[PDB]
Amino acid sequence: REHWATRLGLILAMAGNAVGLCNFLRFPVQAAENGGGAFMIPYIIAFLLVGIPLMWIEWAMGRYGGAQGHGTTPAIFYLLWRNRFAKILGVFGLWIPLVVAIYYVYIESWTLGFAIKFLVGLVPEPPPDPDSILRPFKEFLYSYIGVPKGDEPILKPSLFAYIVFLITMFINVSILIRGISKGIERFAKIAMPTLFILAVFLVIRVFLLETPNGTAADGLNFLWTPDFEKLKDPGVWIAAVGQIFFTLSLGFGAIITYASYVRKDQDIVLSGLTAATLNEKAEVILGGSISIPAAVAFFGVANAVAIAKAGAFNLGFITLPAIFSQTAGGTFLGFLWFFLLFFAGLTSSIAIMQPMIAFLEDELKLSRKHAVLWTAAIVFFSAHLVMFLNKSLDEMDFWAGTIGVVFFGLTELIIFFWIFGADKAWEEINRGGIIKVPRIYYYVMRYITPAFLAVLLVVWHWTVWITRFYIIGLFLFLTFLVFLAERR
Numbered sequence: 477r478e479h480w481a482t483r484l485g486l487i488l489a490m491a492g493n494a495v496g497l498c499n500f501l502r503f504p505v506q507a508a509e510n511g512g513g514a515f516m517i518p519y520i521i522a523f524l525l526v527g528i529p530l531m532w533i534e535w536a537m538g539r540y541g542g543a544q545g546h547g548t549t550p551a552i553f554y555l556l557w558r559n560r561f562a563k564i565l566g567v568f569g570l571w572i573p574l575v576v577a578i579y580y581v582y583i584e585s586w587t588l589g590f591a592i593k594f595l596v597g598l599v600p601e602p603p604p605d606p607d608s609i610l611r612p613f614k615e616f617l618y619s620y621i622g623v624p625k626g627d628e629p630i631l632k633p634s635l636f637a638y639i640v641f642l643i644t645m646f647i648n649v650s651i652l653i654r655g656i657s658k659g660i661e662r663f664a665k666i667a668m669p670t671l672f673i674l675a676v677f678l679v680i681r682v683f684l685l686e687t688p689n690g691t692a693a694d695g696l697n698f699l700w701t702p703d704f705e706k707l708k709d710p711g712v713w714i715a716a717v718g719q720i721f722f723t724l725s726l727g728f729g730a731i732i733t734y735a736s737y738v739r740k741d742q743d744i745v746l747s748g749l750t751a752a753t754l755n756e757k758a759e760v761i762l763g764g765s766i767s768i769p770a771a772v773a774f775f776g777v778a779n780a781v782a783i784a785k786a787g788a789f790n791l792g793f794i795t796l797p798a799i800f801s802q803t804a805g806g807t808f809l810g811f812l813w814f815f816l817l818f819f820a821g822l823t824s825s826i827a828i829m830q831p832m833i834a835f836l837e838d839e840l841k842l843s844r845k846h847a848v849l850w851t852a853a854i855v856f857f858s859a860h861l862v863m864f865l866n867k868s869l870d871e872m873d874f875w876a877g878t879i880g881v882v883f884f885g886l887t888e889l890i891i892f893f894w895i896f897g898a899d900k901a902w903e904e905i906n907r908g909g910i911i912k913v914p915r916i917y918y919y920v921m922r923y924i925t926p927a928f929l930a931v932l933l934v935v936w937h938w939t940v941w942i943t944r945f946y947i948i949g950l951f952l953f954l955t956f957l958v959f960l961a962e963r964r
């Protein structure tokens with residue numbers, strides 16, 4: 477079984493797992509929609525009551541499974557809970573990452589194509605009224621992905637977009653087929669410093685922005701001024717816990733698969749804490765200080781919130797490049813932004829496609845080459861439904877990327893800390909750690925986190941069926957594979 481070569485390499489690979497498109501695309505939108513600073517206070521709390529404990533739990537479950545040669549949740553749930561329903565629940569740990577990747581890699585291909593076109597300078601040229609500049613870029617995006625012009629929910633991606641998607645899939649395959657250390661870790665050691673440097677440069681350049689409508693400091697103040705009145709609103713807590721799940725890759729089965737290659741005796745407490753802290757630094761500091769500060773600097777706080785309500789794609793692929801186009805060297809700055817997004821999306825897509833590869837390797841005894849190639853074939857085939865059927869991405873992100881991840885985090889917490897045991901799980905978490913988990917977190921993992929998640933869950937066109945029917949089929953397919961494994 478493969479193992480990580482260096483501890484720093486493991487930290488950077490886990491950071492690349494956590495640091496992705498969400499940090500720079502969803503967190504600005506979710507923070508601006510929930511009142512700026514009024515969203516930051518619960519988010520941090522959700523990081524302390526939900527994020528870190530589930531991170532440690534997934535690390536421990538991954539290492540525990542990998543010690544016995546099982547990297548995926550169908551087998552790890554059965555190890556922690558000897559029951560067929562445990563395998564059925566673990567099938568979600570393969571279904572969620574695959575379905576998520578099916579469109580995540582397409583968005584990553586978007587970022588790659590935009591980076592290419594901005595480096596070559598094949599960008600729209602607006603004339604010297606905000607709509608006068610936003611419309612050329614908007615249409616620029618609409619021609620790339622093929623937004624429907626009429627009532628039919630049919631997408632028509634450009635040939636360049638399809639070729640760039642092929643290239644993105646090829647890059648993911650070239651990274652994954654080389655293995656854990658020689659592929660994921662080696663690429664992480666290069667991509668993470670690049671990501672941080674690009675994010676820091678963009679943060680500085682955006683902080684240097686100022687128009688008669690405001691400054692980037694105004695956006696930073698809007699994002700960092702606490703509003704204790706909105707602590708009463710449950711929707712802020714819903715958004716905060718959901719964003720924590722999305723940014724820390726919790727409930728996607730990826731952290732478990734990555735930790736399954738950590739050796740039996742290696743540390744998981746300090747390592748996972750450092751990885752989560754790096755991701756939080758990148759998203760909260762760097763990711764949050766690019767889009768929203770520039771939007772506030774060019775339009776003010778109210779118009780920036782109104783633009784953020786339009787969606788993550790509209791802010792990341794239309795509004796920010798249009799804003800950059802009004803500054804000296806703005807095309808190159810947009811190229812830097814899209815290259816940052818592409819490296820983030822790549823370091824996340826390899827991580828969310830690794831679970832299926834690990835399942836095929838451990839449970840069906842497929843070689844790494846065959847496993848990577850078959851996973852790539854499945855993802856590339858299924859991605860056409862997202863590429864051509866409108867709102868299929870929305871359905872996949874709702875069922876697998878939103879409901880599925882939260883329910884799966886709750887399920888893994890219940891299986892590890894209630895079914896498998898509380899003292900056993902705690903000792904497995906703290907075994908071999910450079911530092912020890914604070915004792916209070918025990919009562920956070922056993923009582924506070926599941927009750928929090930349950931309370932928040934409780935308080936929380938026909939073509940959609942086309943997507944649903946498909947992804948359900950995928951689940952069945954995966955189940956059949958599990959069945960075959962059990963018969964082998």
Ligand SMILES: CC(C)C[C@H](N)C(=O)O
Binds near residue numbers: 495496576724728
């Ligand atoms: C699906 C996950 C890889 C997403 C990742 N946590 C991100 O920030 O984009």
Ligand code: NA
Binds near residue numbers: 494496755759
């Ligand atoms: Na993240």
Ligand code: NA
Binds near residue numbers: 491493821
């Ligand atoms: Na990443």
